[PDB]
Backbone as a ProteinNet text record, in pm:
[ID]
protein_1_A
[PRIMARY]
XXXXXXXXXXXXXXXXXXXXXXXXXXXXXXXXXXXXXXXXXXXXXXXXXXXXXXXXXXXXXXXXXX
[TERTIARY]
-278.4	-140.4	-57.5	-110.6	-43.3	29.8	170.8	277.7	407.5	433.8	515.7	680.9	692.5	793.2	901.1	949.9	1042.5	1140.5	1271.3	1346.7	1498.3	1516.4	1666	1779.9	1905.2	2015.1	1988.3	1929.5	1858.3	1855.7	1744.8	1697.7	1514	1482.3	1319.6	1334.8	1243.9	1290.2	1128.1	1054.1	933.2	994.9	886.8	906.7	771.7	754.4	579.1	555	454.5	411.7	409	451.2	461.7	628.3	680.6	828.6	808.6	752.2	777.9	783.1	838.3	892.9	819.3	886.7	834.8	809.4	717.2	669.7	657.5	760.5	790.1	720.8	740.6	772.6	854.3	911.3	1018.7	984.3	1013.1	904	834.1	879.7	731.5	842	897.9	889.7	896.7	879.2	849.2	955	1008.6	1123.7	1086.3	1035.5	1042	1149.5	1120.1	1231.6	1130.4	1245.3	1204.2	1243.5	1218.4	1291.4	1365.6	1483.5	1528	1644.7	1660.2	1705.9	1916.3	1936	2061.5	2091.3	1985.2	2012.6	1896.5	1922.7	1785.2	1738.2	1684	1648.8	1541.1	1632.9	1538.2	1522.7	1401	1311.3	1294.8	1301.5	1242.4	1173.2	1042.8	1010.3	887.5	833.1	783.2	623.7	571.3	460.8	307.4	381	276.5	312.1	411.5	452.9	459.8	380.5	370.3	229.5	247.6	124	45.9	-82.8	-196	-138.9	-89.7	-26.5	55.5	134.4	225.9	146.8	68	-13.2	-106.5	-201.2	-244.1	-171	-65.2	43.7	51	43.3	50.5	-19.3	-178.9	-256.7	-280	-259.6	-266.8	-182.1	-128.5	-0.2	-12.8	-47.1	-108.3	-231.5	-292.3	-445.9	-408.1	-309.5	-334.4	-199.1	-112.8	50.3	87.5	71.9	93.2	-24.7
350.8	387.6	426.1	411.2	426.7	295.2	325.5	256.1	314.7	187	283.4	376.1	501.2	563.8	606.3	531.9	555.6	610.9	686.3	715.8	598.3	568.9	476.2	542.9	555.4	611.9	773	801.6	974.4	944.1	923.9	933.2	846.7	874.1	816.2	664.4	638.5	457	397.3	345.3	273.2	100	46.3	-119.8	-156.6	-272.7	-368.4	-399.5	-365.5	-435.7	-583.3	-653.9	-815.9	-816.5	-724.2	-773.4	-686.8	-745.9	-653.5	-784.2	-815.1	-879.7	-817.5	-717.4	-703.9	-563	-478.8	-342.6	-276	-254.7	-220.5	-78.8	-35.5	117.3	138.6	229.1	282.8	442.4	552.5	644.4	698.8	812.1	876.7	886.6	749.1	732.3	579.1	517.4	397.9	323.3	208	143.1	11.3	-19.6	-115.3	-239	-338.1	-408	-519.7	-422.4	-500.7	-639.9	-698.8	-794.6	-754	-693.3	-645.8	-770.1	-876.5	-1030.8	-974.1	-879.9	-810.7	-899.7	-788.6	-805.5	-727.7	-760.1	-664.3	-504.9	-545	-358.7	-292.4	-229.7	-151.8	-28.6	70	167.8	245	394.9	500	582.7	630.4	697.3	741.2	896.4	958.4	919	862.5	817.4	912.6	1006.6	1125.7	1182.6	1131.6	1128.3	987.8	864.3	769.5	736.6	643.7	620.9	519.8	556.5	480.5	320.5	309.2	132.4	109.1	150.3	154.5	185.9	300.9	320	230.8	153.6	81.9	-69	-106	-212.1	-207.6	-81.1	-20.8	-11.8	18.6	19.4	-165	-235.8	-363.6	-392.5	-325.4	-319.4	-216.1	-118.1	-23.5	-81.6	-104.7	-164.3	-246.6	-369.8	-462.9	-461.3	-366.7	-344.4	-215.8	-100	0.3	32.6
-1743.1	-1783.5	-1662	-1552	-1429.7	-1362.9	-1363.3	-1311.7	-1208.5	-1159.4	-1109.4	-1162.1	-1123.1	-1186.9	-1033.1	-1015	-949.7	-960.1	-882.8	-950.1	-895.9	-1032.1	-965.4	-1042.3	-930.7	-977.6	-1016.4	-945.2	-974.2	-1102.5	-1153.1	-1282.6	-1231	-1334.3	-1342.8	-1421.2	-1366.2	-1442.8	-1466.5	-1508.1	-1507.7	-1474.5	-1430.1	-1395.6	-1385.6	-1459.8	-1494.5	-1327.2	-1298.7	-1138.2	-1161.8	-1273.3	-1275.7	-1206.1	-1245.1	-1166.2	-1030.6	-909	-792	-664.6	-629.8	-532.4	-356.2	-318	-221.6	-218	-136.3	-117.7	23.1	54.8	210.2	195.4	348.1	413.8	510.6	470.8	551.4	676	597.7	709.9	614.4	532.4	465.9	347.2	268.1	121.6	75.8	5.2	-36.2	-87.5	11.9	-74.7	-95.3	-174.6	-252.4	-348.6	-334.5	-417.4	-554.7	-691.4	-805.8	-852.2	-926.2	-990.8	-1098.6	-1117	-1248.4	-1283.5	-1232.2	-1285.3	-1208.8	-1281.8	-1274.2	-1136.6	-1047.4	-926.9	-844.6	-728.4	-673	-638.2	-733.4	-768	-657.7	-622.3	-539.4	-548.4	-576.8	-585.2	-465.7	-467.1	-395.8	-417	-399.2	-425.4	-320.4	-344.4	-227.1	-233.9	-82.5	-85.1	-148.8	-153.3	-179.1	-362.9	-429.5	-578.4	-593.1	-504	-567.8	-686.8	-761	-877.5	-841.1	-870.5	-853.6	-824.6	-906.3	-911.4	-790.5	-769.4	-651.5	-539	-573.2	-400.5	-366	-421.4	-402.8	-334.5	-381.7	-289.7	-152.6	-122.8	-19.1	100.6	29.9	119	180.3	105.3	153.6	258.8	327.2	433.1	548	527	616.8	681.5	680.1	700.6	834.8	820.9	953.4	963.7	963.9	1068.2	1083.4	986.1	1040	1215.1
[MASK]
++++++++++++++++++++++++++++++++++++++++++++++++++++++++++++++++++

């Protein structure tokens, strides 16, 4: 039941990890960009209040460039 909960537009928002496009880092919080069709949604949230689902994206990126 772990997804990610980002907050967009100061508010909390959930999004399916089937819509996630790309999963950056920035310095110590997570910006990410969704597919929300609208337009490109992009997500913040703190690497240390991120969810299992989201942190895991992550580590696949840290490993061979951080």
């Amino acid at each position: 039941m772990v997804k990610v909960k980002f907050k967009y537009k100061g508010e909390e928002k959930e999004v399916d990890t089937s819509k996630i496009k790309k999963v950056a880092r920035v310095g110590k919080m997570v910006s990410f960009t969704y597919d929300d069709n609208g337009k490109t949604g992009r997500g913040a949230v703190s690497e240390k209040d991120a969810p299992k689902e989201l942190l895991d994206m992550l580590a696949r990126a840290e490993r061979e460039k951080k």
